[PDB]
């Protein structure tokens, strides 16, 4: 039965594919991949969806449908997403296989500009799960079709926390991969504060992954003094120093990076810090069990001991 349904979805393609019009509704699109999305949740069926060439089949009619028009359409996209999100986790070969149909991944960072907030969920966690452990050549794919830039500036107008969690942490992944990408976060207009703004995120996962971005960008931000004034009137000193008392040791390794950058190679904030408390703060987690934390604790410490004013 699941191979049936997977010649259904190529055979509609195959009929999109010779008009390059076919509307979705007309041979039970949705329908055929609402099943193949419901099952794509049980791991002894994923291991036949891999070997029927599932995984080619769903991701060429996202990318088919979003080719052709740019509630039906919108709602395959959905469960193709959902499908597609299932079909990467943990599976890394899935991944790569996935980051190199560059056509499909320039109409899925595409679908982060859609009126459907739910797809933008959906997609981001589909980018999520290809940022995650990614291979040399994902990083690349990833990079070339712009992830970065447009999960950045999708970011700046999200209004529900699911959707904004799944972006924020392939921005995460996405930022560690190269300077390049932590300089498309940078560039983007009212992106720095927002990052700033997550770190006191009110309804901790949105906190650990905002200051997981802000945490890699920093070391373009210390060089950056007009990004530091941006930091400073949204006061970020002074919630990262917060964040080292924090029960979650991703938080308390955020900031450690973080300061590490900040507090270097700047009289400004150097001076700041040592008004705020920074030394008693980061002495405090010198002597760690965490390498991250002890790294940086004292990182950022012998930034500021070697800068007294």
């Not at 991949?33 to 080619?56: I, P, T, W």
């Not at 995120?201 to 070391?219: D, F, P, Q, T």
């Amino acid at each position: 039965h699941m191979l049936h349904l997977l010649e259904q979805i190529r055979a509609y393609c195959e009929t999109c594919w010779e008009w390059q019009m076919p509307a979705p509704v007309e041979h039970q699109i949705c329908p055929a991949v609402c099943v193949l999305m419901k099952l794509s949740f049980d791991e002894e069926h994923r291991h036949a969806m891999n070997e029927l060439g599932g995984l080619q089949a769903i991701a060429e009619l996202l990318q088919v449908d979003c080719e052709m028009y740019g509630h039906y359409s919108i709602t395959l996209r959905r469960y193709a997403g959902m499908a597609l999100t299932n079909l990467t986790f943990g599976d890394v070969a899935n991944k790569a296989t996935l980051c190199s149909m560059k056509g499909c991944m320039r109409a899925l960072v595409a679908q982060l500009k859609s009126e459907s907030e739910d797809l933008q969920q959906v997609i981001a966690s589909v980018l999520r799960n290809l940022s995650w452990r990614a291979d040399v050549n994902s990083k690349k794919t990833l990079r070339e079709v712009g992830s970065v830039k447009a999960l950045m500036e999708c970011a700046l107008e999200v209004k529900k926390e699911s959707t904004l969690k799944s972006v924020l942490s392939a921005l995460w992944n996405l930022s560690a991969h190269c300077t390049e990408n932590k300089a498309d976060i940078c560039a983007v207009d009212g992106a720095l504060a927002f990052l700033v703004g997550t770190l006191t995120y009110r309804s901790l996962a949105i906190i650990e992954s905002g200051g997981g971005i802000l945490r890699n960008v920093s070391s373009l931000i210390a060089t950056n003094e007009d990004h530091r004034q941006i930091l400073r009137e949204n006061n970020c000193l002074q919630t990262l120093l917060q964040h080292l008392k924090s029960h979650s040791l991703t938080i308390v390794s955020n900031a450690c990076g973080t300061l590490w950058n900040l507090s270097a190679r700047n009289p400004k904030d150097q001076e700041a810090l040592w008004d705020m408390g920074a030394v008693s703060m980061l002495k405090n987690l010198i002597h760690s069990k965490h390498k991250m934390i002890a790294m940086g604790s004292a990182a950022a410490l012998r930034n500021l001991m070697a800068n007294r004013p």
